[model samples]
Target chain A: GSHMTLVLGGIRSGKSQYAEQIAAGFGKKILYVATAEMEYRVRKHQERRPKSWLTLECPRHVASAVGESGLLDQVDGVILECVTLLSSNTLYAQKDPTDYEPFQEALIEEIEALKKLIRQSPVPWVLVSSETGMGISQSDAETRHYCDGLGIANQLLAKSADEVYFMVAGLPLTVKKG
Target chain B: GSHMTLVLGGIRSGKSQYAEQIAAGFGKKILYVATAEMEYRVRKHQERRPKSWLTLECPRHVASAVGESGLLDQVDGVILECVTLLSSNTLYAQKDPTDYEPFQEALIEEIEALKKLIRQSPVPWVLVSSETGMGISQSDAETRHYCDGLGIANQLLAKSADEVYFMVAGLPLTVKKG
Candidate 1:
């Protein structure tokens, strides 16, 4: 049986590190998925992982990337570093940034597909994402659209997760549990 | 014995409403301390509270306002419907918005004073604050300063709070409990 957990927090709230610990407990072999675009961030995440784990830098099309990797059968667990960057990458890729309807539809499809893939996989999954809506609302339309998209994504994934943790100052506050 | 509970959440996360529920549990007469400057927001909050409850529109100097009002001994409970606006009010009041150190020091002092007042009061206290640091980092320096100040304030109050609740989609997630 596969277990799905969602780890959520603000920047530098120790969400990624906590997710890594959960994945490590699953087994020795882990498939570490990286969605961050900044070179510095990517390097930071890479340096933290065990050398034995496989790294996949899929900023978009994460569900398909994992399915085609042919590595799910080999790893003990799967860890997607974040949904915030993935949502941002998808939102900016659209020709019309202000057209929130299409971007939302596309992101929802991507989230659903990823959830389906995780449900079918034999190994447990740990999904990392930012709780981005807690801040003061932005005035820019693009930023507002992005926040709305990511906020909905977090709520959707959290509802499906077997366990959900909200990180604060390097501590995990249990939001949900089986 | 007086109880202090901090309710943290993003905009429209039902934080204020949750705090109201908790305050109502304590007694009939509640002191609603509102820091929001927007008239519409203040009216909306006013409409939600019972007519018997008192509402104080104190944008800053919340501790002093409550102390001087001579209502602490009269009210059964106190609900400060945000730390975010109070921090913003204090931040913008500073002559130099770019100079963060003074703003931080002033806000911290305000928080400590408010906590002291709450400690001395016989009534239970429920503090409402936005979890502003979870969102994407802002590009503007002033916004960044405001977020940093409010984030620290939330942490400070949460530490002193006997109980803490993090709201999501109108649901309360227990972050701390005695």
Candidate 2:
């Protein structure tokens, strides 16, 4: 069965490096799905990723990436740099920045589809996300949407995963033992 | 089939009064399932409940509250009052609150059961709680726990229910159309 470890940490918190290091342990084929867009923030962040892993250009269709996932490609694990980023990109694609109600309205459906893909994936996944809401309040709408969606997303993921862990202070806590 | 509405409002938000008012609309048999312990804070609160509604003193096995609730006979609704109270009472009737991680761990399963029960229920239920997390920080850890638990429980209920809502300033906002 597929498992997920939610790697959460503060900025420059070694979470991505730790995720990559863990990926190194999987002998089978690994898919490092980079949900980051081709924008400045994403490009700058991608430079942080190890050179060995290629960015899996999934913006609007992460579900497709998970679906076309075939042939073992011998996959022992798949790493999604972050769900929050993927969710943001998807929500942005579906909603105009100006439309508040539509964004809130279409949220759960997008999230449920994301869940379906995760549930059906053939290999384990390590999802990287920042410990955003734990720190402070956000003044912007997109940030708040991102935080709420990511929280609900994390809650859904926690419910779905056989074993779940939360990282804090760069340490992994096995909140849900398999 | 039976359906329930969990009614929650803020402190002194007229939640019980609102619940009683809603139940009175059923215009038929009604049952009150009380899970609140006779604590000083809750006791005074409980005194305000309208005595016309039939009260059931069984919190330990609320599953039995539905044992032919007689809702099918003439009861228009069964007021579960609140899940936060029920869950806490369920835990207290068993063991120390500190040693109660299993409840958190097993909550999804219980929620699924409640989902089934709500579907099986013949009476429309208006369960009540409070919008406790808003405006001010809860004074105690237990209060926060209740809020978080209600949030999650409400999420589960919303997923399974016909409609979902949030009442702000005593104005009910339709969250789910169906």
Candidate 3:
């Protein structure tokens, strides 16, 4: 049976590394879906993974990318590098940047759409996301709105995941078990 | 008996809020020692907490502040808002800030000294810090060093804490239970 695991952590909590380790445990074909903004390390990490795994570069419409690219058919597991950047891409893409509500709805709708694709997959799926809104409260309405949405998205994903792991200081604590 | 709890997360992990909530549960005098760079919301959160708390602003010498201010004597709980900012302040303190090793050493020393003070305290202490090195690896040497040191500090603090909590999206997952 395909296992769905959601790994959540703040920046640098080693959630990515942990997720990669879990993905490796599958011991077969894998697809790494990157959702972060342009960064050089993505390639560096992509190179480090096992040769059996194929890296899929999709910042937006990740689920669609997986479905359309025929990549999902070749992989035993799918690793979505993050949800933070994906949400930001949708939210910040607003025609009027000042309007947070509309973008937030778009963000949620996009996430649900992604979730729908993921739920239909027969392969194991590992999703990584940042716990970015918990340290301090934002001063502005927009930032707060985004944080609130991110937080809720995390909760939604966690609720549906077969298992949920919270990474901390390079360690993984299983918060939810299937 | 003195109890120490280390609350760790990245930016937006809601660790600060979670720590404050624990402090308030003491139902007595509380002292919040903030270590972040000047922010406007510090005052905002202060207003929300019960008036029994005496907010203490100590960005660098938090351990020394506890010793010298005599504020620790009046509070049953001390919540140090963060270790990440303290490390950053010290790391970026040098006018010519090119050297990474020296600043990193200083960060560890400062954290260890603060730990010593915390260990000797008669009241409960809550320490907050970001697990800043586990995400994408840094390209810059200075950032890499800073993150390396920050991760080590989190581990050090966690090792000594009576309890340790890793917050994710505003929820506290207990890593170590006293």
Candidate 4:
């Protein structure tokens, strides 16, 4: 049996570090699912991760990526770096950025696929996600739509997670526990 | 002796509702310190609050308003609705919105004063604030500055408060409890 843990937080709230720590606690041979595409961010994460761990450059289609890599059976734990970038990347790739239906469907499908993969596996899964709805509402339509998408995705993942922690200023607050 | 509770969350995260609930548990004769200036938001809060509770419309200079009203001695609890709007109001009021130093100094002073007032009071003080830094970084400089300001403010308040809760999807995750 495996456990799923979702770490939610605002920017610089130390969610990534916390997620990594959780995965590390599971075992040494962890699979780091890197979702961030930004060069600087990617490099920063690369520097922080242990060399022994396997890195999957998964910006989208995470479940499929893991399955294709054939690493799910070998790794002791899996760390999905974040949902914020995954959502944004999926949203912008849609035929029309303003069209919400396509983006929503795509993101839901991706999450569902990932959930299935996690449930069927025996390795611990630690997820990192951003809490975006707490600030002042953005004036622009695109950002607002992105916020709504991410918020809904977070809630969905949180509902299914075995344990959830909300981070603030490097502190982890328990949201739920099995 | 008094206790201060800080509730941090995103928009529509049930922070206000939770703050009100905490105040209700304190006792009757609650002083509702309204910081939101938007007409629709104000009306919505008014509708939700108990008619027996006294509402004070104070958007700026919160400490002075609380002191001048002379109602601190009469109320069993105080609820300041939020810090997001308050920070935005304070930031825009500056001579130059681009200059962060003045806005930062003013916000720090205001928060320090509020902390003093809450510490000296005998009644329960529940402060609500927005957590804006978790989302994707904004491109505009002003929004970034505003996010930084609010983030710093939240950290400061969380440090001094007897209790701190981070709201997510209408649920409170305790960051710190004395």
Candidate 5:
């Protein structure tokens, strides 16, 4: 099992395009986990990809869905389109804003389990997330929470990944090399 | 049945006067559900109250203890001073911040249930929560979440209450008389 890799970039940072290229070269089928809620734009909104890709919807419980759905072993490669939408789903799940504490803890738990799964599963995995924190400061509480969570998740995944890359202007810059 | 009313104010905002006076009129046997935790100031904060108060710790689930302990209808009024403290306890319960949905829902459910029980219980009630958002806007994601949750809870209570008052600089102004 490849210990997985993470690719992150801001909008138009070419992250999706770069991820497509990486998954295409791999000898295994790409199991794409699409987390986008389709609230804004759907049906090929984020990127241009072949229609034959294997897609799954695990927006709320991505980690658990992967484990129980048998996708962890069935797929040769797994690529999560973006982590921001999943993080947003977690936020939306809050009945009260204060529930953020437990929600955050659960997120870390999910990430930890994901790290373990990525290491144990006989497949290559890639995570894609936005790099929104580096831009202008968040102007709202909800969006800020989402961005902070994604940033933290990205850092954790990168720390454990076999390789970490940042895509900018259609260029891939590697931060960690396996 | 005395539906409890909170004497909301800044630290010295004449809230205690309203709280003490209201408590005095209700009866001598009053149960105070204190939410303050992890602080020595708890005593100093409580000592200000007259000795007729039977203080108890309920934190975020103050509403739960009110109902489950059968104190909801037995007591003259239950005053939960400052929900932020309860929110803090909720934060303590979380393994991560992103997993806040359930905590908020559970607490809200608890409060809503207690409100129903308080309606007829001469077990009158008073709820007290500080003006969390009135202070300078919170800068951190966690603090912002805390503020937003408290505000939401406060709003819910105010909407369903017999009367709602806003205290500023030691003066009480009636905003809603339900």
Candidate 6:
């Protein structure tokens, strides 16, 4: 697999654009993973590419989305548009939305499996996520839980990835480009 | 006069570091305008520079803070550490907490004056601001108003700036390098 690259940014900081530029360079087989179920997001990603780029919609069960399946074997690279949404999906997927502790564990466990899968793949991985916790601290438990979960996901992924880029104002700063 | 540069970023996106790097290259005279009244922020900035860097405290009246003093005439470059807090301070400075409109208008007008101050400087100007609208929208009218006010201030500054940067996750992307 090529070096795993983690792209982090805040709203309108050009994280998606930076990651898209990186994905366009990944040789033959490339898969774009859309974690959110938003129509506009899907449509935007659609407008950016042609028929050759395969996109997987994984709102939940990302493990199944990334597992061996049709065209999964041929994938040489994958772009996870975001892990923040995935964390939210997992955190809220439980029977009790406020049950943060157990679900957080499940989410991390799932990401661990996904990381192993990425490591085993014959391609480089580009993971895109948001940076939270810079603004006023959230007063509500639910929002705080979401931010904490997402921040943990980012820190874990950064530790695992071979390269990390922080995107701001449409500029890419190379944090760890090993 | 050197062109003004506006740097925007989310929390922990490393906007400060990026701005600091730029200011360090501006020959000798660099005035860092601290907009917030946070003691730790002042302490942190103080630890980073030699005494000659000439830090100015301006919770409001940023224009006055930058002018009048003889040292201001000698300043080769100026960096407004942030416009976010300044906007907040302006918006909430009213005697009645419900009074939003007049204060908001005051903020815009003051920012306009600060822009003139930055432009008339002998050297470059770097304006640092927080990028706020990217995350979840605020529910209350006051928070929303503050966000909108700051966003408007950012747009105004960006228009007058010769260079604009958006910093995220510790990386700087040049939105407008001119």
* TM-scores for candidates 1 onward, in order: 0.60, 0.46, 0.61, 0.61, 0.47, 0.61
Cα error of candidate 3 at position B147, Å: 0.8
Task: Estimate candidate 4's alpha-carbon lDDT, on a 0 to 1 scale.
Answer: 0.84
iRMSD of all candidate structures? 3.2, 12.8, 5.3, 3.1, 19.5, 4.2
Q: For candidate 2 chain B, which ten residues in a row score worst on lDDT?
A: B164-173
Q: TM-score per model for chain B alone?
A: 0.92, 0.71, 0.88, 0.92, 0.80, 0.88
Can you write out model 3's per-residue Cα lDDT over B44-84, one digit (the tens) per residue? 44336678788888778778877899887888888887888
**Docking outcome class, model 3:** incorrect
lDDT of 1 by residue, A1-178 (tens): 2399899887789998999999998899999988877354324434657988998889888999899998899999999988989999989899999889989999999899898998898899999998768876698888888888887788778878888888989999887788
What is candidate 5's CA lDDT for residue A71? 70
The DockQ of predicted model 3 stands at 0.12
Choose 3 or 5, whichever is better by TM-score: 3
Clashing pairs in 1: none
Per-residue alpha-carbon lDDT of model 4 for A1-178, expressed as tens digits? 2399999888657688788899999899999988876355324534568877998888989889888888988989999988888998899898887778888889999999988998887788999999888656677777888888898889889988999998886578888998
Better of 4 and 6 by TM-score: 6
* Whole-model lDDT values for every prediction: 0.86, 0.58, 0.77, 0.84, 0.66, 0.76
lDDT of 5 by residue, A1-178 (tens): 2458788766787888777777765544678888766367345555556665678877777777787888766666788877767777777877754445756766677678778877777778888876655332345666666655665677678778877777768797666675
Error of 6 at A170 (Å): 16
Q: Which ten residues in a row have the lowest lDDT in candidate 5 chain A?
A: A131-140
Q: List the residue pairs that clash in candidate 3.
A: A12-B134, A12-B135, A132-B12, A133-B12, A134-B12, A134-B13, A134-B14, A135-B13, A135-B14
Per-prediction DockQ comes to 0.23, 0.03, 0.12, 0.25, 0.01, 0.11
Tens digits of per-residue lDDT for model 3, A2-98: 3788888767789888898888875588888988664545334434778888878787777778889987777888888888888888777788756
What order do candidates take by DockQ, descending? 4, 1, 3, 6, 2, 5
Clash counts for the predictions, in order: 0, 11, 9, 4, 25, 5
Which stretches of model 4 miss by more than 4 angstroms? A38-47, A134-139, B1-130, B134-139, B152-162, B166-173
The better candidate by lDDT, 2 or 3, is 3
State which candidate has the highest lDDT.
1
Q: What's the residue-level lDDT of A97 in candidate 1? A: 95
Candidate 2 predicts chain B with a TM-score of 0.71
User: Model 2, which residues run further than 4 Å from truth?
Assistant: A38-54, A69-74, A98-101, A105-107, B1-178
